A paper describes a structure:
During ubiquitination, the 76-amino acid protein ubiquitin (Ub) is attached via its C terminus to, most commonly, Lys residues on substrate proteins. Ub has seven internal Lys residues and an N-terminal amino group, all of which can be ubiquitinated, leading to the formation of polyUb chains. For the remaining four chain types, linked via K6, K27, K29, and K33, very little is known, and proteins generating and recognizing these chains in eukaryotic cells are still elusive. We found that the human HECT E3 ligases UBE3C and AREL1 assemble K48/K29- and K11/K33-linked Ub chains, respectively, and can be used in combination with DUBs to generate K29- and K33-linked chains for biochemical and structural analyses.
Numbering used by the authors:
A (entry chain A): 1 to 76
B (entry chain B): 1 to 75
């Protein structure tokens, strides 16, 4: 299914995902598509930060839902 | 000299730079430190989108000043 991933300035991309995909999985897909390392990514749905080990369906993320992506700048 | 690079969540890092560094050079340093491809980096100082061919002193970016890093999400 298709979901949207959005930045705080409104920039948007689309991802192909499965309901059982983990957030870890989703970050790997963003890396594949955009070249952003998974440990630089923080994903947000319904104003809450998503945990790597949980699935899309765990968070009731559905087709055409929108997630927000922000940078961790984890390299410091 | 050091400058700050800040995101729209407030996440802020410090970068060691020179006035003569080009914006391209700075994005390379960000790629070096954070693993973010330069093509994903939009840098903004005093309301302006920074262009790769110009230098920090070119934009009057001085010691201890802050610029913003925002994602492009192109590729």
């Amino acid at each position: 299914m298709q979901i949207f991933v959005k930045t705080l300035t409104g920039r948007t991309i689309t991802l192909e995902v499965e309901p059982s995909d983990t957030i870890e999985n989703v970050k790997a897909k963003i890396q594949d598509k955009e070249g952003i390392p998974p440990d630089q990514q923080r994903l947000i749905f319904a104003g809450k930060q998503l945990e790597d080990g949980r699935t899309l369906s765990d968070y009731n993320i559905q087709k055409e839902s929108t997630l927000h992506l922000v940078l961790r700048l984890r390299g410091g």
